[PDB]
Scaffold this active site. Structure first.
Site, PDB file in Angstrom:
ATOM      1  N   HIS A  83       0.858  -1.178   0.000  1.00  0.00           N
ATOM      2  CA  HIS A  83       0.000   0.000   0.000  1.00  0.00           C
ATOM      3  C   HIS A  83       0.893   1.226   0.000  1.00  0.00           C
ATOM      4  O   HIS A  83       2.115   1.114  -0.098  1.00  0.00           O
ATOM      5  CB  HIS A  83      -1.099  -0.014   1.071  1.00  0.00           C
ATOM      6  CG  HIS A  83      -0.603   0.110   2.473  1.00  0.00           C
ATOM      7  ND1 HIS A  83      -0.085  -0.957   3.174  1.00  0.00           N
ATOM      8  CD2 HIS A  83      -0.614   1.158   3.331  1.00  0.00           C
ATOM      9  CE1 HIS A  83       0.228  -0.570   4.394  1.00  0.00           C
ATOM     10  NE2 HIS A  83      -0.074   0.707   4.509  1.00  0.00           N
ATOM     11  N   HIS A  85       1.570   3.728   2.143  1.00  0.00           N
ATOM     12  CA  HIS A  85       2.180   4.362   3.302  1.00  0.00           C
ATOM     13  C   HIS A  85       3.696   4.154   3.319  1.00  0.00           C
ATOM     14  O   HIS A  85       4.253   3.345   2.581  1.00  0.00           O
ATOM     15  CB  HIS A  85       1.562   3.813   4.579  1.00  0.00           C
ATOM     16  CG  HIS A  85       0.162   4.277   4.800  1.00  0.00           C
ATOM     17  ND1 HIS A  85      -0.704   3.638   5.647  1.00  0.00           N
ATOM     18  CD2 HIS A  85      -0.519   5.337   4.306  1.00  0.00           C
ATOM     19  CE1 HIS A  85      -1.856   4.273   5.679  1.00  0.00           C
ATOM     20  NE2 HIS A  85      -1.770   5.316   4.876  1.00  0.00           N
ATOM     21  N   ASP A  87       5.781   2.803   5.352  1.00  0.00           N
ATOM     22  CA  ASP A  87       6.364   1.512   5.687  1.00  0.00           C
ATOM     23  C   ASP A  87       6.327   0.539   4.514  1.00  0.00           C
ATOM     24  O   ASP A  87       6.788  -0.603   4.637  1.00  0.00           O
ATOM     25  CB  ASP A  87       5.728   0.919   6.953  1.00  0.00           C
ATOM     26  CG  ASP A  87       4.228   0.735   6.856  1.00  0.00           C
ATOM     27  OD1 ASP A  87       3.570   1.342   5.980  1.00  0.00           O
ATOM     28  OD2 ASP A  87       3.698  -0.004   7.717  1.00  0.00           O
ATOM     29  N   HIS A 148      -7.402  -1.508   5.727  1.00  0.00           N
ATOM     30  CA  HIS A 148      -6.490  -0.542   6.313  1.00  0.00           C
ATOM     31  C   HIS A 148      -6.289   0.656   5.384  1.00  0.00           C
ATOM     32  O   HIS A 148      -6.131   1.792   5.843  1.00  0.00           O
ATOM     33  CB  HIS A 148      -5.181  -1.273   6.580  1.00  0.00           C
ATOM     34  CG  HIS A 148      -4.049  -0.367   6.893  1.00  0.00           C
ATOM     35  ND1 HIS A 148      -3.795   0.082   8.169  1.00  0.00           N
ATOM     36  CD2 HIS A 148      -3.114   0.194   6.098  1.00  0.00           C
ATOM     37  CE1 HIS A 148      -2.753   0.886   8.150  1.00  0.00           C
ATOM     38  NE2 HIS A 148      -2.326   0.969   6.904  1.00  0.00           N
ATOM     39  N   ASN A 179      -3.286   2.804  12.864  1.00  0.00           N
ATOM     40  CA  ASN A 179      -3.529   3.941  11.992  1.00  0.00           C
ATOM     41  C   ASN A 179      -4.730   3.645  11.116  1.00  0.00           C
ATOM     42  O   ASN A 179      -4.675   2.775  10.242  1.00  0.00           O
ATOM     43  CB  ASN A 179      -2.295   4.199  11.134  1.00  0.00           C
ATOM     44  CG  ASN A 179      -2.493   5.350  10.168  1.00  0.00           C
ATOM     45  OD1 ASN A 179      -3.499   6.062  10.233  1.00  0.00           O
ATOM     46  ND2 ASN A 179      -1.523   5.554   9.277  1.00  0.00           N
TER      47      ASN A 179
HETATM   48  C1  LIG Z   1       3.681   4.323   9.100  1.00  0.00           C
HETATM   49  C2  LIG Z   1       2.702   3.195   9.393  1.00  0.00           C
HETATM   50  C3  LIG Z   1       1.866   2.932   8.153  1.00  0.00           C
HETATM   51  S1  LIG Z   1       0.731   1.537   8.416  1.00  0.00           S
HETATM   52  C4  LIG Z   1       1.778   3.582  10.504  1.00  0.00           C
HETATM   53  O1  LIG Z   1       0.945   4.426  10.294  1.00  0.00           O
HETATM   54  N1  LIG Z   1       1.869   2.988  11.694  1.00  0.00           N
HETATM   55  C5  LIG Z   1       2.762   1.934  12.157  1.00  0.00           C
HETATM   56  C6  LIG Z   1       1.902   1.220  13.181  1.00  0.00           C
HETATM   57  C7  LIG Z   1       1.027   2.298  13.776  1.00  0.00           C
HETATM   58  C8  LIG Z   1       0.977   3.421  12.757  1.00  0.00           C
HETATM   59  C9  LIG Z   1       1.565   4.688  13.268  1.00  0.00           C
HETATM   60  O2  LIG Z   1       1.344   5.779  12.710  1.00  0.00           O
HETATM   61  O3  LIG Z   1       2.323   4.558  14.204  1.00  0.00           O
HETATM   62 ZN   LIG Z   2      -0.431   1.692   6.360  1.00  0.00          ZN
HETATM   63 ZN   LIG Z   3       1.905  -0.361   8.336  1.00  0.00          ZN
END
Ligand SMILES: C[C@H](CS)C(=O)N1CCC[C@H]1C(=O)O
Ligand SMILES: [Zn+2]
Ligand SMILES: [Zn+2]
Ligand SMILES: [Mg+2]
Length: 234
Positions: A83, A85, A87, A148, A179
């Site tokens: 996706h 984001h 990560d 998600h 998130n």
């Molecule tokens: C950068 C990633 C994309 S899934 C994220 O949003 N996370 C990682 C897990 C929780 C949440 C957050 O903003 O901390």
């Molecule tokens: Zn994400």
């Molecule tokens: Zn993620």
């Protein structure tokens, strides 16, 4: 034996062999003072490697490539981001500079562009409609529907019965929503059920963050998502 967030300094990447020819990669980032792990996948593709997702950032992804070269010694020739984001696409430029052909669906590429994130070079056709699946070498890519994120893909390795759920699937230790800024809460349970229906034989299920499990991670995620859906504002 799976690497946990406290065993990986930010900037470092661990590889974990899940099955023959299938690894996860684990990296970490700090967010708001907490440290979070993030998983991707590496799948043996003949004498090459297919990478699923970056290691969450340019520095981590450079470390990921160095660790792959050290520990596996086969070239990463293609990468798929599941996706839009950071990560998943953060580090695309590092992969591109190392000669990796980077791929994502048109929906991921458009959302990454809107967000100002890195954009994989190649477009994966045939994934725009919920329930669509396409083969990509040693994996099947499946678009289960919005969850998600509207673009989230899952990745199945048929030879190993490994399902990479990405951030649409939560680890068991996550009992509250993560998130959800880009999520489709209304569709997420239906999308999870599509995963169950398409891969009921999956033996290993890898969440986007945290410890692998089995298909039980699916209903667990549905429970967490529904609890968040029904949050009461008083
Ligand atoms: C950068 C990633 C994309 S899934 C994220 O949003 N996370 C990682 C897990 C929780 C949440 C957050 O903003 O901390
Ligand atoms: Zn994400
Ligand atoms: Zn993620
Ligand atoms: Mg649960």
């Amino acid at each position: 034996e799976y690497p946990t967030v406290s065993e990986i300094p930010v900037g470092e990447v661990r590889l974990y062999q899940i099955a023959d020819g299938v690894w996860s990669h684990i990296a970490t980032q700090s967010f708001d003072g907490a440290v979070y792990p993030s998983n991707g996948l590496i799948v043996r593709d003949g004498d090459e490697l297919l990478l699923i997702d970056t290691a969450w950032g340019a520095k981590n992804t450079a470390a990921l490539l160095a660790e792959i070269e050290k520990q596996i010694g086969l070239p990463v020739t293609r990468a798929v981001s599941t996706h839009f984001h950071d990560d998943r696409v953060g580090g695309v430029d590092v992969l591109r500079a190392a000669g990796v052909a980077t791929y994502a669906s048109p929906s991921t590429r458009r959302l990454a562009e809107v967000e100002g994130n890195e954009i994989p070079t190649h477009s994966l056709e045939g994934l725009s409609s919920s329930g669509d699946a396409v083969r990509f070498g040693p994996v099947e890519l499946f678009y289960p529907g919005a969850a998600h994120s509207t673009d989230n893909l899952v990745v199945y390795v048929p030879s190993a019965s490994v399902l990479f759920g990405g951030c649409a699937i939560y680890e068991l230790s996550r009992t509250s929503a993560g998130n959800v800024a880009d999520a489709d809460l209304a569709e997420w349970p239906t999308s999870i059920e599509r995963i169950q229906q398409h891969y009921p034989e999956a033996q290993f299920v890898i969440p986007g963050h945290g410890l692998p499990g089995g298909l039980d991670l699916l209903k667990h995620t549905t429970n967490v998502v529904k609890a968040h859906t029904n949050r009461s504002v008083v």
